[PDB]
């Protein structure tokens, strides 16, 4: 098929800018060895040179920036996704490069107990993409979560292992397994 | 300021796909250690499974494909560019990251002999972004082009060296040099 899955994502610099400065300061807190719970909004908003009203109008909660950053991160994936030659492995290999390219997100994601949000966000795009691409799912709404839940858990293992896994390494792994499920 | 760097592309899936198919073969052909001069459109198309009629209408010569690839990165770059707070160190890191991300492309550029193409486009992007931010080089051919040539050299020195450099190292060195060039 030749359907674009990417969506121009029109948004101004101001909205994006407030996000970049808001998330980018959150990461510092993480990197700075402090608990997620302990982050007051005032604390976050001041550092980012963000007015609370701006954050509040745009963002209900701090955890919300992470959802947005996850949402922002998936934006690249689509742009490349159309571009990449489409094979199950390429999509798989496209996914692998995405996980291996931001490790800092995932640590932040688990850190904030944002795992459910990632799943909610990521899965929806799996559907949407598949709807655009004419793929059909045993189950309206479970196959998706499986892939997303499975990605997340892939991300998790990688980050927990001392070892470094090349894509060739991982792709081989994701196949020993598939064989196991039959 | 709040003005936007990223141009917008509404590019057909087919058009986007064909370029992607085309670059892969060039990528594969280099990796095979094949001569660029040796390469012919018939072999590339037969190998690349693209209509030979289709290829000519878009570009006169094979080197153009490399031209498009450089352009594609530009699009992500621009996208990436907007999503960072704009500071000199900040801009430097993004560029750097890109030289690091795209090592395969750069080798093709030299194998290709597509340097003078890189400079023109990447020098074109720079001029264009600079105007948007209101920035003025006095010689506005020289500054963009000169900056374009420095970017190529980083890749080449980076490509050439067995030793490997972290971004933080590069910034220190890049700043090391500027102190030396003042």
From TrEMBL, chains A, B:
SUPFAM superfamilies the UniProt entry points to: Homeodomain-like (SSF46689)
InterPro entries (UniProt xref): Homeodomain-like_sf (IPR009057)
Protein name: Lin0861 protein
